[PDB]
Structures are given as structure tokens and as C-alpha cells.
Amino acid sequence: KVYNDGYDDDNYDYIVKNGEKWMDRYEIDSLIGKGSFGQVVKAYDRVEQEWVAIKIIKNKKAFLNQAQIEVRLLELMNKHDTEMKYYIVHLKRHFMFRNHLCLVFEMLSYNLYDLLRNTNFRGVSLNLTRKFAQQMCTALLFLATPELSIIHCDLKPENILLCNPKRSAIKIVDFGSSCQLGQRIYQYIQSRFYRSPEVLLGMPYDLAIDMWSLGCILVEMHTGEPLFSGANEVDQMNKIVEVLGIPPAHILDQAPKARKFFEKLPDGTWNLKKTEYKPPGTRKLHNILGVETGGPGGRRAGESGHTVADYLKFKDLILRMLDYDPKTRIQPYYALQHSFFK
Numbered sequence: 258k259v260y261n262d263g264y265d266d267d268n269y270d271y272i273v274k275n276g277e278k279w280m281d282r283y284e285i286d287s288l289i290g291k292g293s294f295g296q297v298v299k300a301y302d303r304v305e306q307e308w309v310a311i312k313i314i315k316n317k318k319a320f321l322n323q324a325q326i327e328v329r330l331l332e333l334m335n336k337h338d339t340e341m342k343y344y345i346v347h348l349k350r351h352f353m354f355r356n357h358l359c360l361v362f363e364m365l366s367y368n369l370y371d372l373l374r375n376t377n378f379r380g381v382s383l384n385l386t387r388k389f390a391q392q393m394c395t396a397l398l399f400l401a402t403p404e405l406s407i408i409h410c411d412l413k414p415e416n417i418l419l420c421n422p423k424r425s426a427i428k429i430v431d432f433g434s435s436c437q438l439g440q441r442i443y444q445y446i447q448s449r450f451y452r453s454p455e456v457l458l459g460m461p462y463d464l465a466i467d468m469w470s471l472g473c474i475l476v477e478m479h480t481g482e483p484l485f486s487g488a489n490e491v492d493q494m495n496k497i498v499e500v501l502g503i504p505p506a507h508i509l510d511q512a513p514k515a516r517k518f519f520e521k522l523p524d525g526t527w528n529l530k531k532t533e534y535k536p537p538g539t540r541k542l543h544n545i546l547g548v549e550t551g552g553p554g555g556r557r558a559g560e561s562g563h564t565v566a567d568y569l570k571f572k573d574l575i576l577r578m579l580d581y582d583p584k585t586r587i588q589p590y591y592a593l594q595h596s597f598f599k
């Protein structure tokens with residue numbers, strides 16, 4: 258009947274109450290989100306005199322230990338002096354309150370899915386998409402810092418927020434499924450829509466999985482719809498294949514999960530298993546973006562900064578981010594020097 262003296266519910270979450278004052282400091286206002294980790298709440302900080310987003314972790318060993326790993330990575334990112342760390346959400350501080358670990362973040366505007374929902378899933382401009390692409394590449398360059406080497410491992414429109422509703426500044430959020438580079442513990446990783454072929458194929462992986470995710474995300478910001486919207490791993494891969502063609506043979510020969518999607522024929526070549534989909538490599542990114550047809554759905558026709566020249570620079574940058582090989586896939590440093598950002 259009673260859970261944590263009545264402060265928790267039946268599934269270990271703290272009972273969020275509007276107007277409750279925590280430690281004579283944090284004035285709780287309203288619930289923002291609830292995940293598996295727990296809940297996140299909007300609260301006003303009285304000593305700092307500013308709004309904050311308090312992430313309230315569940316009263317559970319499994320979710321507490323995971324949030325401690327997140328704290329360790331957030332605080333390790335704060336240690337570095339550079340300016341490019343400000344494209345990640347600032348963990349201000351953490352504390353224990355009535356048996357719940359509470360992470361205090363800076364208060365932010367909406368997520369990028371809410372931005373796409375405001376467009377009725379028709380997308381934002383190539384001018385705005387360039388601004389997010391640069392800042393996300395700057396964020397991924399920060400994560401690639403050798404002493405950090407952090408893989409976010411779950412980049413999607415919901416995990417990218419806007420700083421202010423008027424300003425066009427974005428910041429990457431939720432490092433709950435994040436670990437530093439190393440030996441492989443986890444295979445089923447990333448959100449399916451933004452999941453890399455090396456992850457789908459059961460191959461080794463590294464920082465490059467976040468760039469694949471970025472590539473997908475940036476097309477979705479300008480088109481409005483997800484690029485590869487698979488209902489399962491098979492459907493995911495078939496949608497990747499119909500845009501980028503069949504993965505290269507040398508990758509598929511090494512891949513332990515290659516036989517889930519593809520089939521090695523008697524001649525030695527690889528091909529899709531039977532299951533609807535267009536032939537491999539036929540739904541060109543050129544036509545999805547609308548390089549010559551005035552943008553996606555003809556909606557950017559005659560709008561400034563949406564020329565054939567500007568769309569080809571964007572198409573080229575995206576194809577480098579969506580390289581099948583994670584070794585030749587473009588890195589944050591070279592991405593930031595792409596002609597799309599000139």
C-alpha cells in the first residue's frame with residue numbers, strides 16, 4: 258500500500274506535487290517528462306534565482322547506478338575548459354532527496370520533434386538546418402575529444418532541445434544510454450530510425466554511429482519525416498538499402514548479422530532476402546531532398562538559400578555522414594570544414 262513512506266508510487270517514481278518546496282530551495286512547478294529512468298520536472302532555484310530542469314531518478318538500484326554513470330560522464334565533460342562544451346546540456350549539480358538521485362540541468366525550450374510537429378511534419382529551412390548541423394557537428398567534435406571519447410548512442414529529434422524558443426541554439430540531451438569508447442558490451446543500441454548499419458549488422462562500432470544518426474536527423478529536419486522509418490530491423494535495413502544501395506561486400510563478409518537481411522548468392526555477391534521496396538539504391542537522396550524540384554514537396558521554391566548549389570552541398574554532406582563504412586565516414590572536424598557551412 259505504502260511505498261517509500263508515501264513519497265513513491267507502485268512503480269518507484271516520486272509523486273510529483275505542484276508547489277512543493279525541496280530543501281528550502283527548489284520550488285517545484287510541473288511535470289515535463291516521464292521515462293524509464295524516472296521523471297523530469299520544472300523547478301525554480303531560489304539561491305541562483307533561475308528556472309531549472311530537475312531529473313528525478315527512480316528509487317531503484319538499476320536506474321540509480323545508470324544515473325551515476327550519467328553523472329560521471331556529465332561531470333567529466335564539465336571538467337574541460339573549451340567553449341564547444343556549451344552545445345551539451347550543463348549538469349549544474351546533483352543531490353539525494355528522499356532516497357531519489359536528482360540531477361539539476363539548465364531549463365530549456367522544446368525538443369526538435371515538437372518543432373517538426375509545429376510544421377505538421379513539413380520541416381524547417383535549409384538555413385535553420387545548416388545552423389543545427391553546424392552546432393551538432395560542434396557537439397560531436399567535443400564528444401570526440403580523446404580524453405572524453407563519449408558515444409551518445411541515442412541521437413534523435415527528442416534528444417536535441419532548443420535553448421530558447423526565439424534563438425536557434427540547440428543542445429544534445431539525455432546521456433542515460435551513453436558510455437565512453439571501448440570494448441563492446443552492448444549490441445542492441447540506438448533508436449531504430451537512427452540506428453547505424455554496423456549496429457544492425459552486429460559489427461564493431463565507435464563514435465561514427467552518432468554521425469550516422471546526425472545524417473538521418475538533418476534530413477528529417479528539412480523534409481519533416483524520418484529518413485529510414487523501419488517498423489523492425491529488417492524493414493529498417495531495407496529502407497536504408499533502397500536509398501544507399503547494398504552494403505559493400507567486404508562489410509557483409511565480416512558482418513555476423515548479414516544473413517538476417519541479405520543472402521550470399523552462388524557467384525559471391527550479396528543481395529536482399531525476400532519479404533514493397535524499390536530496387537537497391539533507386540530512391541536517391543537527390544529526389545528526397547528535391548535538389549532540382551524546389552526542395553521537399555516543392556515547398557522551398559524561390560526561397561533564399563535554397564538553390565541547386567545549396568542543395569548539392571547539403572546532399573554531399575549527408576552522403577558522407579551516411580557512408581556505410583564507419584572508417585571512411587566523415588568526422589566532426591572535416592564535417593565542420595564542409596562547403597555547406599561556408
Ligand SMILES: CCC(=O)Nc1ccc(C(=O)c2sc(Nc3ccc(N4CCN(C)CC4)cc3OC)nc2N)cc1
Nearest residue numbers: 289290291292297310362363364365366367368430431
Ligand atoms: C521521454 C524521456 C525524456 O523526455 N527525457 C528527458 C526529459 C527532460 C530532459 C531535460 O533535461 C530537459 S527537457 C527541457 N525542457 C522541455 C523540453 C520539452 C518539453 N516538451 C516535451 C513534450 N511536449 C509535448 C511538450 C514540450 C518540455 C520542456 O520543459 C518545458 N529542459 C530540459 N533540461 C531531457 C530528457
